[PDB]
Design a protein around this ligand. Sequence first.
Ligand code: ACO
Length: 152
Amino acid sequence: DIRPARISDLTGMQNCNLHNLPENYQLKYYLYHAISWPMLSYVATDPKGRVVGYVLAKMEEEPKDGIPHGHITSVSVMRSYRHLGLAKRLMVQSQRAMVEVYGAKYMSLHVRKSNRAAIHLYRDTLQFDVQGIESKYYADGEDAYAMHKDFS
Ligand SMILES: CC(=O)SCCNC(=O)CCNC(=O)[C@H](O)C(C)(C)COP(=O)(O)OP(=O)(O)OC[C@H]1O[C@@H](n2cnc3c(N)ncnc32)[C@H](O)[C@@H]1OP(=O)(O)O
């Protein structure tokens, strides 16, 4: 059901976002970056091989002081498969690989201010802190919450 993401998963991934299309805006870019950090990014696949959820991530390329840290760049579970703990499961596997493989000291992400489900997922169940608002972060103008999880 869960396996590393591949370049050929792009179409399946796009199809997870049929009812929240802004998640496709940067998907290809983030997928290319994901692939260049093996073991960080995962797809969840139904009995027919169909992608029904995914997590994309990357390590910072030129970290300050050489201190490794990670970014979750996109996570999505199609509506049919939501509320099953799939996103939780994907995020945890990505987290564990960041720490165990690349020695991440922490991880960061951005989320739209209006994305109540994702904020709850990050803040309540995965215990991220909120650093603050990054004004006009998205191409369409919306602010992002900048969020962080320390692996200390
Ligand atoms: C860094 C970025 O990628 S930001 C963009 C985030 N991704 C998107 O918004 C894509 C569109 N949305 C999605 O695909 C989904 O709604 C996701 C990925 C946010 C959540 O996927 P799910 O599989 O439903 O979440 P999952 O079942 O693993 O976890 C549930 C938890 O997330 C939270 N949550 C999920 N949906 C909701 C909801 N509709 N409203 C409130 N909290 C919610 C809760 O805190 C919850 O724990 P609980 O079951 O004890 O209440």
